[PDB]
Amino acid sequence: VPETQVSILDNGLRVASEQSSHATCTVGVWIDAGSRYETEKNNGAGYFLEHLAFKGTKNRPGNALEKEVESIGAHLNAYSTREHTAYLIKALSKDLPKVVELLADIVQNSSLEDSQIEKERDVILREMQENDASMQNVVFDYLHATAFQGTPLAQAVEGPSENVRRLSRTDLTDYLNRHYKAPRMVLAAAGGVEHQQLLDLAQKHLSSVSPCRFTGSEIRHRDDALPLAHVAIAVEGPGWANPDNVTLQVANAIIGCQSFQTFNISYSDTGLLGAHFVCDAMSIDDMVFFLQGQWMRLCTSATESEVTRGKNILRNALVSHLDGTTPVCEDIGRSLLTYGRRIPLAEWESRIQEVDAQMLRDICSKYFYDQCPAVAGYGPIEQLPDYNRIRSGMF
Amino acid sequence: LAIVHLLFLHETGSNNPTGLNSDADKIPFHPYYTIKDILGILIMFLILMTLVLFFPDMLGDPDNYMPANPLNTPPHIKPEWYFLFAYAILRSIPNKLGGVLALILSILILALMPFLHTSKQRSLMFRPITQILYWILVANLLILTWIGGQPVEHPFIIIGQLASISYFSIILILMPISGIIEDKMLKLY
Numbered sequence: 001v002p003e004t005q006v007s008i009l010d011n012g013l014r015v016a017s018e019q020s021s022h023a024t025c026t027v028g029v030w031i032d033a034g035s036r037y038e039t040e041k042n043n044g045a046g047y048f049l050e051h052l053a054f055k056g057t058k059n060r061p062g063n064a065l066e067k068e069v070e071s072i073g074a075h076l077n078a079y080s081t082r083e084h085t086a087y088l089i090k091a092l093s094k095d096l097p098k099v100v101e102l103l104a105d106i107v108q109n110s111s112l113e114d115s116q117i118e119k120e121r122d123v124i125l126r127e128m129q130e131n132d133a134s135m136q137n138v139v140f141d142y143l144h145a146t147a148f149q150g151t152p153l154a155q156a157v158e159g160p161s162e163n164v165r166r167l168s169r170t171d172l173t174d175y176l177n178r179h180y181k182a183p184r185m186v187l188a189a190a191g192g193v194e195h196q197q198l199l200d201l202a203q204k205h206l207s208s209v210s211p212c213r214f215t216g217s218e219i220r221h222r223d224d225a226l227p228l229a230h231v232a233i234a235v236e237g238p239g240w241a242n243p244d245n246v247t248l249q250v251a252n253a254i255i256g257c258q259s260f261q262t263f264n265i266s267y268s269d270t271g272l273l274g275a276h277f278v279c280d281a282m283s284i285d286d287m288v289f290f291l292q293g294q295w296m297r298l299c300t301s302a303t304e305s306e307v308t309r310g311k312n313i314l315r316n317a318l319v320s321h322l323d324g325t326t327p328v329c330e331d332i333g334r335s336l337l338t339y340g341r342r343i344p345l346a347e348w349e350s351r352i353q354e355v356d357a358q359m360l361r362d363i364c365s366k367y368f369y370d371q372c373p374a375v376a377g378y379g380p381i382e383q384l385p386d387y388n389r390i391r392s393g394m395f
Numbered sequence: 396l397a398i399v400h401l402l403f404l405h406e407t408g409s410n411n412p413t414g415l416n417s418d419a420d421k422i423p424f425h426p427y428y429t430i431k432d433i434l435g436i437l438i439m440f441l442i443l444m445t446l447v448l449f450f451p452d453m454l455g456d457p458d459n460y461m462p463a464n465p466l467n468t469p470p471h472i473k474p475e476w477y478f479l480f481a482y483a484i485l486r487s488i489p490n491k492l493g494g495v496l497a498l499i500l501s502i503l504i505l506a507l508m509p510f511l512h513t514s515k516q517r518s519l520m521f522r523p524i525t526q527i528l529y530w531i532l533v534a535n536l537l538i539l540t541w542i543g544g545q546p547v548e549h550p551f552i553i554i555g556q557l558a559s560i561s562y563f564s565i566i567l568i569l570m571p572i573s574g575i576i577e578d579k580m581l582k583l584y
């Protein structure tokens with residue numbers, strides 16, 4: 001697998017690339033700026049700037065931005081999490097000169113038209129009025145909240161409607177001018193790109209860029225008119241950099257009622273490790289029990305075969321050139337923002353093959369057993385057991 | 396018979412001190428009302444062992460340690476405290492039969508109690524006049540417990556006669572009339 005080569009410019013912006021023989025490329029800008037860096041007076045600034053970032057910059061007033069990035073034939077995407085913001089474009093590699101330039105203006109000298117500002121306010125607000133339809137997102141945004149209380153991590157990426165209505169260009173300008181610093185930025189490229197050409201384009205454009213504690217808790221939004229119930233139970237994830245994350249991923253691969261997914265969400269030295277399941281009310285209790293059993297099961301039933309199993313499924317999850325440019329870029333941007341380097345797949349394979357059953361049950365015992373859980377329920381959740389009961393697996 | 400009790404209750408569930416439908420707020424029993432019952436068991440055992448190990452004869456009558464004199468009798472004979480009032484009631488009615496019947500009714504009046512409920516509210520948490528009548532009922536129950544102890548002579552007798560009259564009149568007459576008045580005050584009747 002070709003190595004990911006990283007350079008660093010005057011601004012501090014990093015320029016990471018991973019050349020591949022695929023023909024198109026996914027060039028993106030990551031920024032270490034999310035809802036964790038907001039201070040409850042600008043709780044929707046990143047989301048609302050993510051809406052305003054494609055509505056024209058001085059150089060591209062009006063629909064120019066979308067038009068050109070449309071004409072070139074590229075797909076323009078952006079997303080925001082609690083810790084990272086990404087503005088990425090997938091286009092024909094021959095379009096690199098075009099691409100970099102457009103992206104530059106997106107992350108700098110973006111001209112928020114107050115006309116649009118008002119418009120987006122409405123968009124965000126109205127969607128939020130309906131964002132309630134995404135029960136799963138709801139469950140996952142209180143889980144974050146209930147656990148990370150009194151901590152920036154709690155505030156959702158979207159932010160409270162209140163703030164959405166009460167936001168102004170200057171505030172946005174601040175978030176933009178405060179959390180868009182060049183040392184906290186990665187220009188990541190994946191696919192048919194040359195690293196020297198991308199470094200020269202980053203020098204030509206973009207060379208101008210200038211606590212958290214886990215709280216055991218439970219939030220039971222009871223609404224009996226909903227047909228199905230969604231319940232998430234989590235404990236404190238190790239973090240992004242913690243080595244044991246890998247032995248925890250294998251544990252998730254061992255676990256894999258209904259829609260019983262498993263998650264290991266990682267933030268800067270914290271996270272949520274757990275399971276989300278949707279079930280008819282009458283079975284919620286049973287399901288809860290099962291999940292708990294499985295976790296302690298890892299603590300007691302790490303059959304080597306299953307250990308291997310989990311390792312293998314993890315082995316087939318690692319992202320690679322095969323997965324495509326975007327998947328890879330995305331990994332390059334997150335790796336330079338979180339680890340400070342791109343971890344190659346050989347190092348991931350070494351960290352997977354060093355995992356055995358004994359260290360898996362050791363790492364699991366440290367995190368699942370005797371760890372107050374964070375419970376978030378939504379729907380007909382009367383038969384969902386209360387905390388004393390949940391924390392008390394007793395088996 | 397108690398086992399029957401528990402069954403006839405789970406069909407309906409326990410009541411709450413507000414007297415309202417508690418279906419919106421119910422919790423498990425294992426971790427919430429079990430440790431509470433364990434604490435109550437511990438406190439009841441504390442009172443029982445300080446009754447046994449420190450004052451073992453404050454509730455009994457010394458007469459017990461006297462082998463029965465098939466021939467002689469205790470100058471002062473009294474039924475035990477728990478029933479003291481019961482007999483107090485008897486002592487009150489002049490007629491022997493009357494006493495026996497009233498005595499029985501004393502206990503039975505309770506059974507008769509579910510047919511005397513004339514209020515639209517189940518509990519007495521929001522019913523102050525019937526609360527006053529209830530505490531007057533507890534008061535003259537304590538009075539009847541005291542009278543039973545007292546010997547037959549003035550004025551213990553009159554109190555006994557009144558206390559019994561007041562007991563039966565509060566349970567039979569005063570509480571449903573008070574519940575009607577309380578329903579009238581809330582613009583319900």
Ligand code: HEM
Nearest residue numbers: 396397398400401403404405408409410411412505506508
């Ligand atoms: C043999 C003696 C008795 C025993 C062992 C007994 C035991 C119990 C137990 C274990 C309960 C369930 C716990 C509770 O409700 O707090 C209960 C409930 C109840 N018992 Fe008794 N009981 C006895 C006599 C009585 C008598 C004489 C009455 C009537 C005056 C009575 C009226 C009730 C009522 C009304 C409840 C339901 C109260 C509620 O939960 O809101 N019991 N009993």
